[model samples]
Target chain A: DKEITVAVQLESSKDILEIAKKEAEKKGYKINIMEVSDNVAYNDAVQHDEADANFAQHQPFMEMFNKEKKADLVAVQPIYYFAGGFYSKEYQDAKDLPENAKVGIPSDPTNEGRALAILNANGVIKLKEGVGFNGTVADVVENPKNITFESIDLLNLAKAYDEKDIAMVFCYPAYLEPAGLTTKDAILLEDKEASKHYALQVVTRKGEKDSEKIKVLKEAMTTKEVAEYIKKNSKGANIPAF
Target chain B: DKEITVAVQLESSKDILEIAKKEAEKKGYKINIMEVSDNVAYNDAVQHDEADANFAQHQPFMEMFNKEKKADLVAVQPIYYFAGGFYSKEYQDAKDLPENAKVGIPSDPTNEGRALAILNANGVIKLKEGVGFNGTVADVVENPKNITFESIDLLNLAKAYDEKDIAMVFCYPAYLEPAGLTTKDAILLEDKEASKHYALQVVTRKGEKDSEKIKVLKEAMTTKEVAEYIKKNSKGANIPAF
Candidate 1:
């Protein structure tokens, strides 16, 4: 099936992939770019008649995106990821959370939920049963520090640290740099790495899953040039998948 | 646009719009908050009418923004200011630079120019005549020892400690703690009366000039409660200039 036509979703990551694709092509094969309104829509685009794959969701994010969205957009390759982190105005490190200090997170359920999972991952807080990736503040299993969370717009979540103890952020590379925040700043979890975690994949509709085009796309994505390009450009900001 | 909307952009570590919004609400003033990608967007939000006002820029930046965009965005308040400094991983002290040293700088013309200006101000290196903020490596009119000033991203430039001699960096205090690149390690930049007006500007649409709502925001952002909240949560990244 690694024979032709690979369509991909860029949920606001077009600029990133546009640069990466030139690198992808140097390895051989072509990629088609499609846009989505939000993360959920990104999944829908893949499940429906449009895309062969998506470069957006993280593993946890994709899982929840599919479960919540009641759709199926499997990760043909689980190769690209960006970390999420705890940012604060009051404390410098994770250990700085004060008694009952408020923690701010994004309002969107999926990302907000993911931020909570990341916080739990960092051991800042714990979540209740079955609330793995999609957990929210309401699902916190325990809160010894009384770390209450407030939600704000996704973009404003970073700025919130100016007015709160800490804000958990899900970031894109460009946004991260412009905000003057980096992987080093987070007392937390994620960015595209030069590994498969950030790898853009070749995905297709459920019925067309075994199609030849999807296979070629995947093969093309796994080339040496793609690997070299990802390494050079992302500098580990994004990784490649074979 | 009779009422002005103020966008507060943040680095990844400073997302805190909800707190800022609540603070604004407690004072009985409402202004829409938008998320911005970078300083450029922050400048454009006001000058381009995407948002009537922006609250995250400082005086020095505003002066630059005003000159470049010339859209009449003026500072109604100062959010915070991080005392600036130079950082490096290569040499612990300034005496570390050997002859024919190739120093790195921010690649952007303005920042590279500013870096040169700051270095010259500190007696490290002097720039050629008429080389302004948009200047670069070629602007080195006089180099006593061939100390090359290269421009690179301000963040990653510090990572050059292993390969390069030192990186002259201007930093935000918030970044130091997390980066583990503390003030002690950096060679500090000092001037008796040095301060860039990195103020949050309140801009109004020409169509809505003098609107009551705009007037309220111009003052509300400086209200004791809001300013106090900004101080408490912003963790001293800056002082609120009302």
Candidate 2:
């Protein structure tokens, strides 16, 4: 088919989808934007062949989707990332977090694993060795403290921190940039050396990962028009793949 | 007779507390390892005179305490910014999110909020007005078409890599690494210079900010041994200012 479809994860920074659309035109490739509402739907659409590919996601997110959403998606290219960290309006220091103090977290499985991974990296909790790259709370064999984990939604993270003792959240420039609320209350921020970490990718399935359809969409994402579009629309919060 | 007793927050990783303790003891300073189970107690210990000096907290966290916790605290130095990024076993790019993708975010307000900001920066979504900094999905002014957020626990965010489209979460490397997760799969990345949102530091109670104990502790913390220990034991997660 001459037309390849892309499904972008809907978040404020959903500009990558725009950039990708503009980029495809130069290659004479046609892209249909499928505004993905959630991983469940996104997986369903892509898995059932409803869409050619998905771009707003990274390899990890897709890996999570494969299990959670029961989809068989893969990646074609690197998309982007949003560094996660600890933020709090109510508590100034990380030390202020009490034992079993109501902490908020994303309810999905993948990000929850990511949060615990960060905490483990910070020397807070110790997950057992051999947990591998895809480890989870069930992988925790040496939790001396039993600190506990509270789950919620990605959108309510900030408000949760404001009311709770501590919270671990992500950093998305598009939504946070305009409000000037991005830098106020973080007990700890992830290291920048650790920034630019890769996750977002051009995803597809088995025989379709490197398919011409996926390539057209991937190449289109790097076009000048797409870059400019992202710059103009995202207010500099979103960066083009270029 | 002159005497000073210092309290250090012990990190479970790479002998962090051992290294810091050795450096302090070698400097003719009496240091006590304030072993607390949570961040709340860590800060309270300093305020309640549980220890003369404390480590394991960042500058922003201290400022948060000064503002909300009503515990007079100050940052003597920024130890290092903890690095946090995303990773997964599937997918590759942000465009692979597919339509109606289900995204996972940290549930803890701080990290979850930061995760949203990171996504915004990565062009994942557009939040509503005034939702930045501490904003969440409730601030999602625009979600393109189908993506949704799943708030999850800080520790379990990574596990969601198996459940949702993407799991975004973070804190310090000291916390994330022990869980076997790294930036290998992170899409939107952060770096020290670019990580203005997160600059972690060592802090003290406001009342003891000017005390001699703080001076000694700070000096000991700056030693080569302390830095070397942090480097040697932290496995690169817990970087020190010294």
Candidate 3:
């Protein structure tokens, strides 16, 4: 039996595998889903070959992990762009964020920069020229509104709702759904313009992307059925990016 | 007049733009081609808005520049992938190159590691476990043949073809075309399985991808006309990616 082990986050990208499983079976391969409860496990599973592939993170996130761990993981196919955005309790829209308003952003390298990118793109702030996808608040050149960022642990960002003075906090639906927050709850939704870098991918170890299994898996993930599943189940919180 | 300035290498991606220009004009936008002679200039042009877009390099190269420059230039679409490969005058095939033979690769960070990836993927050499896309020769875990490299300036990698002991050099069609060399001259062509990262892309400034000009431009670049032009004019040197 050709058992292609795939890893995915517990509640995050787990549903997509249900769709992928059906596709792999038609190709005579038995898809083994490896349920990972934590973020690090997904990358670790693939790097160690415990899983043949993963669908839990974006290309940049994987790129960052590959750099730090020296593991060669490749983004085989574009899956879906996570609709992450800036949420707020005090402000109805980004423009309504008061001067000197405190915002909460992720502390890690990749997501921190993505939050800043979304803010910069929406004109809430400006990063120093030439700072593209890697920009952090440290790179902020023009905060005309005197806005300051409170660097919070990525998992704790949504808790800023009651933590005080966090006029805005950037996060995605997966984290927020558990806290009863949704995309409609955000002040600014990450549009196509800014969220391209955060597109989730079907990632595999470096040399395995073109393998017979991956080729069929990629075809299945990109199909209209998979796209429709993400839409029908996500309740408008997650859109089909592929 | 709506003029969209696009950056490209002098003789490399310049001809591809000529095809795009004709197509873009039909959509009511004038394609102002900016012929940049250096690699850095293409991203800088788009980052600074000196040009509306560029098409000389690939996604990974742009991602590297974006990380370093803090500029959020985004790839709007795939244009074409230049056929880059390992060439040799001393050896008719990669297998013919003697064990312990000398090789040449670009010294620049991005291309240097990319050349290693190409080599490692081809069984010409092997790198350390977990040495991902950023593999330098320093990460070489196995040199069963005692294979070694000469670090050449990226612009001067073509010179290695004539340099003694430089048994093989990694280069693209851009440098080989004017010299009367083609993909057929290369001992090992970079196959699709290994060369996906180097596919050329049409990139633009962060927030401008959805602008009227960019929509028209993306349409023009992806048209049947543009694909046919690369095939007919570039012969085997380039292949349309979209």
Candidate 4:
């Protein structure tokens, strides 16, 4: 039973884990990569020890889980950023966003704030001073364009991208993949400043950060081979965070 | 000026910075790579704003410099681990060391403790309870081999490796490069657990971490290309930490 199991939500993470599996094998350990469909399932796997760790969420998303579940989980190492950005079917540039245009954003508070911050950064909207990534729609201090935000579930934001009423939708590269879109198609991609805050991390139970299995997992995930894989496979949709 | 100047102490860091320079150029920024000979010189460059940043030391080593120089430099991101290890010219295995063997360690308090901890991990000695990486020779609680430690400066540990009386000398891969030694030739290498704590970092002044120049530096340093270069060039002498 000298094995480490990691829960993941996306195909990119599964591909990344395959590289990690090989690295772990070199050290006489085995890695079992489990793919679950939903965001919460992966965290639940690690929270209950169904898996030794999970690699789907950024620290803010994980912190939200911890706050709601009252569970103890910690990020061991950040692996990559998802290259999240605002995508538009109608507008070619953020500056071209029409006045009172309907925009789609994630319903979850953490990502919602992130989406808003990106808009604020692009001068499409203005948020209260110092609100940063924690700002909500309620924090909009200046709306010169009068852009109307429609809050939608994160997984469903891709579908919202196709809706006729939505001028732009905030989406991650993975979510937009099925729609034949990538960060290259994004109207405005999140800058490097967002990377340190939103990079997806290897996460385990709070007390398991120093465990032998977790250490092996961290090393395996951060290898040069893994970094190379993320770079090649992501196709400008992900940024290496290691 | 559009150029971001960075101070570095080792050849490996210079090679890594070249990759970062290309990455910075892609974003319309230029990086000036400055090579300094001593540890203090690099940090001094950043502290005095002679350079925008430095990419040479780990957090602890930087903290030591900060404490001494009253500097406000902060680590932007860890780039790689040096694959530090205990090297022996006479003894092939740590267990073969004779009683009362003199082991050479870095005289700097931060690395002295690290050397001792590695020896302790290999069962060559015992440290007082909970002393960890902050340990000194005075904390040795049990020395079954009666191993005596000789503390030498960091740069000179490579020279100590050639001394006849020194059975084992703690060294980083870069320091031993001129002597035709690498971590692969060592008796015991620092494990992955040490990587998080001792990985070399990009550092800048406290207020400049979020500046455009430093952000470019951090992103440039952590790119997949940089990771690949470190892996290919170091030849098992360095481990990617990003």
Candidate 5:
């Protein structure tokens, strides 16, 4: 009767969700993780009351969604910072991207900018002055090499090396694990800077902020055991942001 | 003849621009930093090619500008995450917010959702199902406290605390620092979750991804020296997202 549903992307959230579940259950709150196939649905699930809260995007992405969809969403506790980087199937390093290279960025407003920013920061692309946060293809002002940017969705970023026919694709350091890759395989990386900003966070609806359920989840997620587990498990791909 | 102009907000970008100028000079690219007072002109300066790049917002916010103005802008490297929080003059904790309290949120779609989400997450009000991200007042499904949300500009959020007669206003931690407060003063605070997503980033135009000017700027900003400076300068309020 008092089940608290938590929304999560199937893979990215497994670690935090598991710890949250065990911790939440100990506090007498029923924990249900609503697994979603995509990033878009996780917030929707929590927004529509399909779930009480979620552990998906960071606050900035949530803020972007709030503005775009006219929705009310808020960030709670932070669980981990995922180390994302530029991945290239063809090249060993991002510096190897040839002139006029076709680069792929996420089409979603928040992530597209992140991908583009990475490219821009790493000397891959150049964006218009001051348009850094909401950066888009249109913001391109100078392209000495005439690189073409292709906008793709989040799910496809990892797969872009083969399916998209692009020189480079952005991915999380942890994601390449199943494919037998590590940060060593990354052509570009988050560095400590990106980690401080894009860390994974917990979220909840406005009405549930102070609820016992959220309290249980937050406490469980930040526990010493959970913190150590994340450190041990994520293999440098994830760092505790709590 | 080889001047590269950068647009910046008067106060926020002074430090970074200083470094970028010096760093870019070594690459034989002359860097000019353009100071502006507001948000609208920075993009225009870039769109019209008056400036090479700008560093004001995140990717999503820039995308909103691109769509509205039909301009091309993109985000490059993330410089830092500005820690924001809910401020209240009369209350010590958000829980202290009385029923039917007047709350101020940013009128901008993105920030409004963020403010509303913060309010919602704290149990101050309830929003309609599935409107979590882009939530507006229309999405208020249940207002048990009958709280009123006032949409204010980001610059005016602090001012609204008095003139608007609102109980709480969300603010950038740095924005409040000069006023003699820190994150601890916030009735509500942005944790690592918000930092990860909302890190203030660098921006350039779509075509400038590979330009020599941007290349030098990116490299300079992400240098260990610059990164270390940002880490030390912002104290805990900001973190480099390079």
Candidate 6:
């Protein structure tokens, strides 16, 4: 078949995949976007060779999957960041939160650390030295606000945001969209440096990283049209990482 | 003016720039390809702010120019490599060259090192430990062939190849074309890793690297059409580096 299959989980991934499909078509190739229902399914599709690639996870998330499943998925190109940030219904800024405020963060290790890193960046909390984005809540060496942390599943973090006791919650733009919220409504947003770390990537198996299909896929994903579309449609909720 | 001026010295660079021009036009931007007469003129144009960018030199070459002229020209994106290789009318392969054979290399420090690296990669000569692409002829640690080296001006390297005493001469595809030759006619062509070090780049002033003009220029340069054109037109004489 003159087609490449890609596993995707998010609407944004499907949107970007549509742009890549048009580009691939120009080269006499077709892209089959195999929409998956969950995060692990997409990686499993690629890892098991049911699909040629997957476009739903970051390198760190992929690394976590690789470690768990003993897979060889490689991140080929970073396409966009989901513009994760701390959302607050009570405070206008991170500094306005009361001491010992309750915060909701994703329970998954990678995203949990990402939420903590955002807190560290915004002066809401201080992680231990050199912990970086990999730090856990246990790594919090100094909490000037005495912030309390609640770990919730990523899909339910948005629900936790509405809890009366939760002062702040870390959320991705995609998840917040269901709540009619975006990064603009957040108190503090991830900066460009964080974008580098968390950008969603096009991923394939290790040996196929330089294959013709992967090459075309990479070129298609990084086209000006894709970048422009991401910038125009993301509404500050996604940053083009190419 | 809502236009970018780019200084160029090669036909290939201009060809790729023309592709970028069409992409810029789609965004209501224009590109002015200011064809320069010589190598120094293009760099001079960009350094003096006479042009917004230049599309002629590699990173190392630009770094050399930076050091010598105390300039801040930054390589924004690598577009293509001017396939460099050893050409021999007498020998069919690098291994067939005789001992004590006279070889011609570019006198320019950066290219001289590149030519040496190619020779080292092909087992024609041995470079010093960890010298890599920066090693000059003086860094030749093990010359089992006891081959002698002659430094010729890059412009005159093709002419040097015609010399009866020169057993092998390193030449860029662009220069080789004037002699009705290409990498297809060469005895040993550079590998993919070499392309990483010597690919010709789009260059702008350091501070202007992430500017709207340069960003658009970068996007335009790395387009699928540009990469396709480079692959089709180079006839193995050029490699797309985007």
Q: Under CAPRI classification, how is model 6 graded?
A: incorrect
Instruction: Estimate the TM-score of every prediction.
Output: 0.45, 0.46, 0.49, 0.47, 0.48, 0.48
* TM-score for chain A in each prediction: 0.74, 0.77, 0.89, 0.88, 0.82, 0.90
lDDT minimum window of 10 residues, candidate 6 chain A = A36-45
Compose the digit string of candidate 6's lDDT tens values, residues B15-112. Answer: 88998899999987899999964566687668767699999989988897777556799998888776678998788997888998988887656888
Give DockQ for candidates 1 onward, in order. 0.01, 0.02, 0.01, 0.01, 0.02, 0.01
Native contacts present in candidate 6, fraction? 0.00
The reply for model 5, stretches above 4 Å from the true place, is: A1-3, A11-15, A37-40, A89-92, A162-165, A178-180, A232-235, B1-242
Kindly list the per-residue Cα lDDT of model 1 for residues B14-111, writing each as its tens digit.
33344455555655766567776656555555654657666665455666655633446655545444445677665565556667776755544455
The per-model lDDT (C-alpha) reads: 0.56, 0.59, 0.78, 0.84, 0.74, 0.84
Runs in model 1 with CA error above 4 Å? A1-242, B1-3, B11-20, B23-28, B38-44, B59-70, B90-96, B129-135, B162-170, B190-192, B203-211, B224-234
Q: Tell me how many clashing residue pairs each candidate has.
A: 59, 177, 10, 1, 64, 0
Where does the lowest 10-residue lDDT sum fall in candidate 4 chain A? A36-45
Identify the candidate with maximal TM-score: 3
Cα lDDT of model 5 by residue, A29-123, tens digit: 87887876545667756766768888888887888767755778888887777766777887888667788787766656677777777767877
Error of 3 at B118 (Å): 35
lDDT string, candidate 2, A1-242, tens digits: 77887766675325666656666776777788787544544555677676887766657667766764345687766644445566655556656555544445454556666666666677666777855334555566655445545444555455455453444444334335433465444456554433334446777776787778877777776667665766666555444445
lDDT of 3 at A239: 63
Which should have the higher lDDT, number 1 or number 2?
2
Q: Which tens-of-lDDT digit does each residue in A1-242 have in candidate 6?
A: 67999999888789989999999999989999998655666876687577999999999999987775567999999988766788988789887898878888876678888988988887777889998989887788889888777656676778878889889899888788677787789898888788688888999999999999999999999989999989887775677887
What ranges in model 6 sit over 4 Å off? A177-181, B1-242
Per-residue lDDT of B197 in model 4: 89
